[PDB]
Amino acid sequence: SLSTEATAKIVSEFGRDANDTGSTEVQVALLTAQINHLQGHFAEHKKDHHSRRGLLRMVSQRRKLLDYLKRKDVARYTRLIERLGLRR
Amino acid sequence: VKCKPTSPGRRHVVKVVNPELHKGKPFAPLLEKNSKSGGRNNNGRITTRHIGGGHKQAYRIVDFKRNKDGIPAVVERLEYDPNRSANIALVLYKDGERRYILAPKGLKAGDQIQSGVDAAIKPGNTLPMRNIPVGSTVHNVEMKPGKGGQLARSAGTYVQIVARDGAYVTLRLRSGEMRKVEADCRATLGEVGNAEHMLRVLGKAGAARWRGVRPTVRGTAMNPVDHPHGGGEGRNFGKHPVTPWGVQTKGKKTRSNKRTDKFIVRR
Amino acid sequence: SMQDPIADMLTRIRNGQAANKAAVTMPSSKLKVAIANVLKEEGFIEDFKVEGDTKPELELTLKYFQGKAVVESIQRVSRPGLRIYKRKDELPKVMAGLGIAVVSTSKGVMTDRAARQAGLGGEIICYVA
RNA sequence: GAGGGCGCUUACCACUUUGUGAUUCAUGACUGGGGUGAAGUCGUAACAAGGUAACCGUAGGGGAACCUGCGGUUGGAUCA
RNA sequence: CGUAAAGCGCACGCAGGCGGUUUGUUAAGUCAGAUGUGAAAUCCCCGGGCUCAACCUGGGAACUGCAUCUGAUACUGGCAAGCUUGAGUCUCGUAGAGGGGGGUAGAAUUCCAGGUGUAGCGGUGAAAUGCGUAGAGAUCUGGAGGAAUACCGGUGGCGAAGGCGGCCCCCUGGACGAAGACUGACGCUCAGGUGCGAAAGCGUGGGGAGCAAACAGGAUUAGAUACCCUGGUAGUCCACGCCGUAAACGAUGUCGACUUGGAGGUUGUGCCCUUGAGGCGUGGCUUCCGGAGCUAACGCGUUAAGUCGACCGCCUGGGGAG
RNA sequence: GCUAGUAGGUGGGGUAACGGCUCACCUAGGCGACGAUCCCUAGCUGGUCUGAGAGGAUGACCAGCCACACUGGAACUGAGA
RNA sequence: UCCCUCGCGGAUGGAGCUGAAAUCAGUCGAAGAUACCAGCUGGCUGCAACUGUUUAUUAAAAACACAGCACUGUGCAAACA
Numbered sequence A: 001s002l003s004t005e006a007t008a009k010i011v012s013e014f015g016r017d018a019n020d021t022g023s024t025e026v027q028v029a030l031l032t033a034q035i036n037h038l039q040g041h042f043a044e045h046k047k048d049h050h051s052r053r054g055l056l057r058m059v060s061q062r063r064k065l066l067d068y069l070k071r072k073d074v075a076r077y078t079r080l081i082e083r084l085g086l087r088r
Numbered sequence B: 001v002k003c004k005p006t007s008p009g010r011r012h013v014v015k016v017v018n019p020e021l022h023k024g025k026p027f028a029p030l031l032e033k034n035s036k037s038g039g040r041n042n043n044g045r046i047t048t049r050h051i052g053g054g055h056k057q058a059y060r061i062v063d064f065k066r067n068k069d070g071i072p073a074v075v076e077r078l079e080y081d082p083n084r085s086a087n088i089a090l091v092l093y094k095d096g097e098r099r100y101i102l103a104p105k106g107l108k109a110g111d112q113i114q115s116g117v118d119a120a121i122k123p124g125n126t127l128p129m130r131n132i133p134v135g136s137t138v139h140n141v142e143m144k145p146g147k148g149g150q151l152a153r154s155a156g157t158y159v160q161i162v163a164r165d166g167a168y169v170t171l172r173l174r175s176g177e178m179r180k181v182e183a184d185c186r187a188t189l190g191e192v193g194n195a196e197h198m199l200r201v202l203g204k205a206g207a208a209r210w211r212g213v214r215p216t217v218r219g220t221a222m223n224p225v226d227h228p229h230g231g232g233e234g235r236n237f238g239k240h241p242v243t244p245w246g247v248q249t250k251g252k253k254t255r256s257n258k259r260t261d262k263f264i265v266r267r
Numbered sequence C: 001s002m003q004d005p006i007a008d009m010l011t012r013i014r015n016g017q018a019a020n021k022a023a024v025t026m027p028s029s030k031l032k033v034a035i036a037n038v039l040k041e042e043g044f045i046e047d048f049k050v051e052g053d054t055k056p057e058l059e060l061t062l063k064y065f066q067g068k069a070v071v072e073s074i075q076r077v078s079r080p081g082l083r084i085y086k087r088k089d090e091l092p093k094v095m096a097g098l099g100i101a102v103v104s105t106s107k108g109v110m111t112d113r114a115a116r117q118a119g120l121g122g123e124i125i126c127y128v129a
Numbered sequence D: 001g002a003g004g005g006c007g008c009u010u011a012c013c014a015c016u017u018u019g020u021g022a023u024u025c026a027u028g029a030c031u032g033g034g035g036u037g038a039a040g041u042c043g044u045a046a047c048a049a050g051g052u053a054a055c056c057g058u059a060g061g062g063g064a065a066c067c068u069g070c071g072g073u074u075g076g077a078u079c080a
Numbered sequence E: 001c002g003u004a005a006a007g008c009g010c011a012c013g014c015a016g017g018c019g020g021u022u023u024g025u026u027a028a029g030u031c032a033g034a035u036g037u038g039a040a041a042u043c044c045c046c047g048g049g050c051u052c053a054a055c056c057u058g059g060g061a062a063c064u065g066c067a068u069c070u071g072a073u074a075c076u077g078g079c080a081a082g083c084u085u086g087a088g089u090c091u092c093g094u095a096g097a098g099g100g101g102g103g104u105a106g107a108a109u110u111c112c113a114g115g116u117g118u119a120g121c122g123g124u125g126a127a128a129u130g131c132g133u134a135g136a137g138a139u140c141u142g143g144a145g146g147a148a149u150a151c152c153g154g155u156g157g158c159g160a161a162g163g164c165g166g167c168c169c170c171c172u173g174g175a176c177g178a179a180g181a182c183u184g185a186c187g188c189u190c191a192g193g194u195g196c197g198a199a200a201g202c203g204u205g206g207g208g209a210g211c212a213a214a215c216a217g218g219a220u221u222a223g224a225u226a227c228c229c230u231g232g233u234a235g236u237c238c239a240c241g242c243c244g245u246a247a248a249c250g251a252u253g254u255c256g257a258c259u260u261g262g263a264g265g266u267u268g269u270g271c272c273c274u275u276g277a278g279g280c281g282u283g284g285c286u287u288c289c290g291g292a293g294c295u296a297a298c299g300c301g302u303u304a305a306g307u308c309g310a311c312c313g314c315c316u317g318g319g320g321a322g
Numbered sequence F: 001g002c003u004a005g006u007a008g009g010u011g012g013g014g015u016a017a018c019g020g021c022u023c024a025c026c027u028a029g030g031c032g033a034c035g036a037u038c039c040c041u042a043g044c045u046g047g048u049c050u051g052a053g054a055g056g057a058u059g060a061c062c063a064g065c066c067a068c069a070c071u072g073g074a075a076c077u078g079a080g081a
Numbered sequence G: 001u002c003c004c005u006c007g008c009g010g011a012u013g014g015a016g017c018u019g020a021a022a023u024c025a026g027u028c029g030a031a032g033a034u035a036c037c038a039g040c041u042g043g044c045u046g047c048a049a050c051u052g053u054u055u056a057u058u059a060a061a062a063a064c065a066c067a068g069c070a071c072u073g074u075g076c077a078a079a080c081a
Helices: A004-014 A024-041 A051-069 A075-080 C006-016 C030-041 C113-120
Strands: C021-027 C048-051 C058-063 C075-078 C100-105 C108-111 C123-129
Touching: A004 A024, A024 A051, A024 A075, A024 C075, A051 A075, C006 C021, C006 C075, C030 C048, C030 C058, C030 C100, C030 C108, C030 C123, C100 C113, C108 C113
Parallel strands: none
Antiparallel strands: C021 C058, C048 C058, C075 C123, C100 C108, C100 C123
């Protein structure tokens, strides 16, 4: 999954306050990590599909969140997509 | 294929097929320890064992046995050596020395590499069979304790021991079935050479065959003289062995020294 | 429901009746209570109330004359993806007139007769017989 | 003299011509399967536990139904 | 659309369709009024003239529509600010044959070698082929190799489906509970699209014990291109790529809300002289019986085939023909 | 999948009039699964027949519209072809 | 002309020099890729995949070779010569 020293870490970097593990800015960013980190994992094994299903989940789930931001505060979207080097 | 990296495959443009090239060994041009190489197949007079020709050669290169011992080598760089498809690596010791070796699998970028009795059991250097576990994967052993012959054909070429055999003799060459060999001998222990290195097809004679050996094909060709079979209206009937060799298996190698190897089946 | 909150109201009412239940409960809504108000005057339901100034929950009381129940027919019509809007001269007449038909007008929620007596039309809601 | 008409010529274009495809309909030595019929030969595949439970997929084989292997199904009889 | 024809083999998801709750606002949908126009003639109602009728004819009705204007604001839609029960995040636990990689163990088979020992073994309904005096079978010792993991194993568990069973490690997915804390409708479905798919089969290269299409013997039989017996190749195993089908079945699409009960299984949690095996609740998943209802009947029956709502796939007589 | 006068823009030209209608030059666009292009068929409508209706099938006779006049093409005269 | 360690420096300036194609317009002959030079094209079928090789001096082929495939032998003082 992800390490606490990391999950509880990042939350305090995107949260517009403290311990706001809910904030999209947070949750969303929290997803990119476990995603990028897994890309190195999927680079190996490959055939491991049952794990990619979850990978794709968090991916689309992440997008479902990005669309939201755009539909709640245009700024915050473009203001976060950079800090995460998203869009590619 | 089935590993990394796959082997390119030229596309239909001018009757073209499989090639051969590595990931890379950055440089295109050798060191200096090498000879001049002979030339043809002929034996101070007559041809002898027909077939053999074509140009392009040179480059001798060397090292085997590995007399040197407990002195830490470092892989300088993998390198391509002619005629034999088993790469070569370079390697420098902690005293500016520089042998060559038969590039094992996992190598490249520096790495450990140590020889002599009692040394890291990875794919570093030779090691007396004695000081070796089961060696499901040893290397270019030696029928004698000092030499380095055996399977220098590294390219995928392996050898399996038998955990702990006594009497001081073991090993299991590929199709060589079983065969005992002095245990006071040493093996590189790595045992590799990349197999795919020998998984492409030359292509279309000429620029792939000719660049090595002549038309190793004669078939009947008829003419009852040039070969123990010929003439006929347009077919063969009978026996077709050159110099009553009897290509019907037969087998050879009888009596004399050696021949004290074992098992050897017949399918 | 999560998609058809109004259609659920009817179902919860009819499902309760069959089970000879006493009172039906479910999340409230402006339109819901509005509808529940009509059936009240129409004698289809005893009474009705709600609870929660932030978490409202409708409370209806089923009804029955004799061995059988009263509301022995309650179905929807103008549902999503297939809404229905009639005029002052198209409004339906449930059970030849006996049964009522809830219809939202520019004046508010009414019945087949109600809106007609007014001379206006609206989006049909459901048929109650 | 202007200007105009005929005139020659230039452009647009009908007819008409030549290659080359596309499509459609008719037809053909022979050939494949389908359908009827009158039921002939040859066996008995399935329906009973149909007499080796059957069927689906896939593969191979055989006069013919069909036989055999691998997986799934109950749309299997008897207390398996 | 369970069995009659009909749920795509399963997922994810773009477009599309649909959208929890509140207030304001808008007035597009919608509703009301009105103004145009909707040719006349047909049709219809009332009424006229040919002696009646057909027919002819006055006026109206209608022309269900399109537009424009003035309003109405419940519902749908748009905009603004919200709200939390939907959905999601965080924490901490729980169970699991979920997946990918690598190890490793024990039982058995076969084979190779050697010891003991001797005329049978093997097989069938019998038999025969086959193996045996070149010494089998049996027995015992050592070795090689491959495939699958008894017992636990269950009416069990996990997975979207297909499927997934020894023990160990590494990488990894989902499900569920509980105090909670957080986001704030961010959701449901989904043609096309992308991906996953039993077995058999295909390509390259490995491997190959057992089993076994083909094939070969023996037997059965009227025949026996079979069932049975003795052998046995592909294949079954591995890697990597392809093929996409199955009675890919619950023959029952996904999501949500309602609607009597009984007995049981498995897993979480709260609580109870927790003194106990234990007892009382409260969630997840799952068996069997069954009420209302539904059904052509069989039967389904809170895990519905009952009562409803949103979206998608599909059917329209049999053969010919997937 | 379709489309070079093709989609648009400047200009001059042209018509009773807007306009790629036209020509030169500039841009590289315009159409399409809300079905383009392509093939088969077809005059459209008020209406007619059937039908409880919705709907289905149609478009004789009468009337509004369109097109054609032996076939293919062209312009002349004129308010008008 | 501008600048600098510094110089066969750098930058800006664009004189002179050279110079194709296209597009309109006109013109000559019977003819303008005018001479030399410089693919004939297509349709059906056998054989061999294909480049290549061969009877110097009557056979260039469908024959030899070829890459690929398979069988078999060879444990290195290898088999084989």
